[PDB]
Every structure is written in structure tokens, then in C-alpha cells.
């Protein structure tokens, strides 16, 4: 996210990783649904299994490498307020209910990761607007005095 805000034009595959962080006894299912760009985001789990998805039972399998094909996009300006339209979604619906025993906690969590593959590329370097000085920095004149 933050290195692609130093560059205007950017294009390439990404790679998600969803690590489940419940107990060892905690079983259940998720359905991780990659919607391509231009398609509609699934609202129900029925619509979610119609498209590209992956039904992930977290038994011993607690992590999912999830290759996303070619999230691209850039910045725009006309004769601003022109962003990228949409490059799709990765939604997750409860396929089953969560099953924990009486000693494990009822509330389990998910950590999601994101990485780029070797085909991800960046160009037309710009300045990232994530930072910006407005009033002052403390002892900024101490580099001169």
C-alpha cells in the first residue's frame, strides 16, 4: 500500500495470506471469494460461491495462500477527483458456524496478509501524501541555530 503511493502507475499480481488465529480444537469453514474488477461484490454466500472462491476448512490448515491476478490502477486528472474505479474484492463469508469446545474461547480471529509477486511493477514516481507538515516540527530551527 504505502510503497505504491510513492508511484503513480502500478500493475501486478498480489498474494493474500489469511492466517487463522483460533484454538487448535476450533473448526469451521470460510469461503474466500475473489471478485474480479467490474463484477459486483457478493452480498450473500450463495452469490459468493458462484464466482471465484475457495472454501477453506480450518482444520489443520490454518493459512491460505491466495493468488490475486493483476490488481492494477493509477491516478487520473481531467480538465481533480478521479480515482481508480474498482479492482475487485476479496470477500469472506461464514460457510459453517464456528465450532469451539467448552474450554476454547467463543471468539476467534483472522489475520490477513498481502504481498506482491514478482510481476508487480511501479512507475512515474510521485510524492506520497500520507505525510505532510502543516504547522511546524519541534526544534526545526535547531538545525540552523
Amino acid at each position: 500500500g504505502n510503497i505504491s503511493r510513492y508511484y503513480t502507475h502500478w500493475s501486478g499480481s498480489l498474494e493474500m495470506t489469511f492466517m487463522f488465529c483460533g484454538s487448535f480444537m476450533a473448526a469451521g469453514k470460510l469461503i474466500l471469494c475473489y471478485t474480479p474488477p467490474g463484477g459486483s461484490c457478493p452480498t450473500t454466500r450463495e452469490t459468493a460461491m458462484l464466482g471465484t472462491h475457495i472454501v477453506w476448512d480450518f482444520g489443520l490448515q490454518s493459512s491460505v495462500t491466495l493468488i490475486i491476478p493483476w490488481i492494477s490502477g493509477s491516478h487520473y486528472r481531467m480538465f481533480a477527483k478521479s480515482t481508480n474505479a474498482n479492482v475487485g474484492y476479496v470477500t469472506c463469508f461464514m460457510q459453517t458456524n464456528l465450532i469451539v469446545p467448552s474450554e476454547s474461547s467463543d471468539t476467534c480471529s483472522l489475520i490477513g496478509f498481502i504481498a506482491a509477486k514478482d510481476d508487480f511493477s511501479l512507475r512515474l514516481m510521485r510524492d506520497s501524501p500520507d505525510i505532510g507538515q502543516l504547522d511546524h516540527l519541534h526544534a526545526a530551527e535547531a538545525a540552523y541555530q
Binding site: 480444537m25 473448526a27 469451521g28 469453514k29 469461503i31 475473489y34 450463495e46 460461491m49 458462484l50 464466482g51 471465484t52 472462491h53 475457495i54 472454501v55 477453506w56 476448512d57 482444520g59 489443520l60 490448515q61 491460505v64 460457510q95 459453517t96 458456524n97 465450532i99 469451539v100 469446545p101 467448552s102
Partner: protein, 235 residues
């Protein structure tokens, strides 16, 4: 080698470890010596050769069983349900991956059995089962009398069909790979169902707490679909 990853759909489970080629037959396309079957069956790619994961059915202690007639379970769903409502023929085997996720403190045994031509019977009447009693769709149906499989013939002998046991002590999953099981080379999906995935809990679910709502998740992959053509060149 099975690799439960068909098309855009995939099932990343860990403990699957075996599958059952039903009647020892892997599903294939229509063989080339059967040209009688109208000359243009299209062979659709992974648009329909993909896992259609149904609702997870809530398996409690007092549950009798579940049945999904194939391909009635998939006539309303997705690119198989779209192709059924346009093509009048089809020829598809099925890959079913039933898995019943549970802890090590649950018990039970599912007879995940795939019944070819499960002509159901109605109980205590001479009227045949109607269209709404047989053709259910995505929800499937619940066994009224699972000891006689709702056709008067015994559950104890129902392992003559292709079946796997989900004994929640040992395994949580069952994978049954169905071939084209019909007398006809192709058939008619809106009014005929070759297979019936029947999941009958022989040993009921048990745990000391309140009645456990353990889900059984069914994923049906129509392997090696064919259909009517509809794109024929009229010269």
C-alpha cells in the same frame, strides 16, 4: 491424485486423504463411438467443472438424514443452473466432497452414500411422490424414514452403493467421485436425477452440552460436463 481444486472453485482442506471412485469408474466425456447422441454435444470447460458448495446443514442429535438429488441440487445454481435452463441434454459425472467439521469431543457416523436412481417412496399412502416432494434443489430434503431410505429398502444394506463413512472419531470428510450413471448416454436434468447424495447419520451426534449444531458441508463438482450444443453451424 485428486487435488480438490476445480476451476475457480477450490477446497483447501487438510484431512481428506482418500476418495471413492464410484463403481470403480472415473467420470469421462461421451465416447466417440456414441455419435447417435446428437452430433453436437458441447464439452464445457471449468465454467461448470467446479465445486458448488451448498448450505451447511445443521446436524443435531435428532437429525435423521439429508439427501440431494443430482443434478436437481444444481439446477438453480450458477453456470450449471444456467446451462440446465437452456440445454435439454447433459452428461456429467460428479465429484462430491462432504466434510463434517467437528471437534475431538464430538461423536457420530455419517453414511455419506451416493444412490444411483433413488426412486423415493411416500410413507403410508399409495400416491406417488409429487414434483415438490422429489425435486427440492439447493436445500435438498430430509429423510422421513432413514432406516428404509424412504423407499422401503434397508439402510443396513445401503452400503452396496458407493459410500464413505464420516466417523467423527477418525475422519471428518468423505469424497465420492461419481461417473455417468445412466442407461442412456445423455439425459434430461430438469426431470431426472441419476444420483442421490444421501447423508444418513447412523450413530447420532453426542456431547454433554446442549444439542450440538455441527455443520455438514456439501460441495458438488459436476466433473466432465457435456450438454446440448446450441451453437451448430447450419450450412
Amino acid at each position: 491424485v485428486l487435488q480438490l481444486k476445480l476451476g475457480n472453485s477450490a477446497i483447501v482442506t487438510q484431512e481428506a486423504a482418500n476418495y471413492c471412485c464410484a463403481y470403480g469408474e472415473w467420470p469421462n466425456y461421451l465416447p466417440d463411438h456414441e455419435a447417435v447422441a446428437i452430433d453436437k454435444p458441447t464439452q464445457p470447460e471449468t465454467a461448470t467443472d467446479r465445486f458448488y458448495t451448498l448450505k451447511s446443514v445443521k446436524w443435531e442429535t435428532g437429525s435423521t438424514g439429508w439427501w440431494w438429488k443430482l443434478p436437481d441440487a444444481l439446477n438453480n445454481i450458477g453456470m450449471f443452473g444456467q446451462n440446465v435452463q437452456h440445454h435439454y441434454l447433459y452428461r456429467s459425472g460428479f465429484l462430491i466432497h462432504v466434510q463434517c467439521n467437528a471437534t475431538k469431543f464430538h461423536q457420530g457416523a455419517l453414511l455419506v452414500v451416493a444412490i444411483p436412481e433413488h426412486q423415493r417412496g411416500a410413507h403410508n399412502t399409495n400416491t406417488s411422490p409429487g414434483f415438490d416432494d422429489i425435486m427440492k434443489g439447493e436445500e435438498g430434503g430430509t429423510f422421513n424414514h432413514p432406516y428404509v431410505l424412504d423407499d422401503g429398502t434397508s439402510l443396513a444394506c445401503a452400503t452396496i452403493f458407493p459410500h464413505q463413512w464420516i466417523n467423527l472419531r477418525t475422519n471428518n470428510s468423505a469424497t465420492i467421485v461419481l461417473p455417468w450413471m445412466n442407461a442412456a448416454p445423455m439425459d434430461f436434468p430438469l426431470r431426472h436425477n441419476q444420483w442421490t447424495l444421501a447423508i444418513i447419520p447412523v450413530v447420532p451426534l453426542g456431547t454433554r452440552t446442549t444439542s450440538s449444531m455441527v455443520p455438514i458441508t456439501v460441495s458438488i463438482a459436476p466433473m466432465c460436463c457435456e450438454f446440448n450444443g446450441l451453437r451448430h453451424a447450419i450450412t
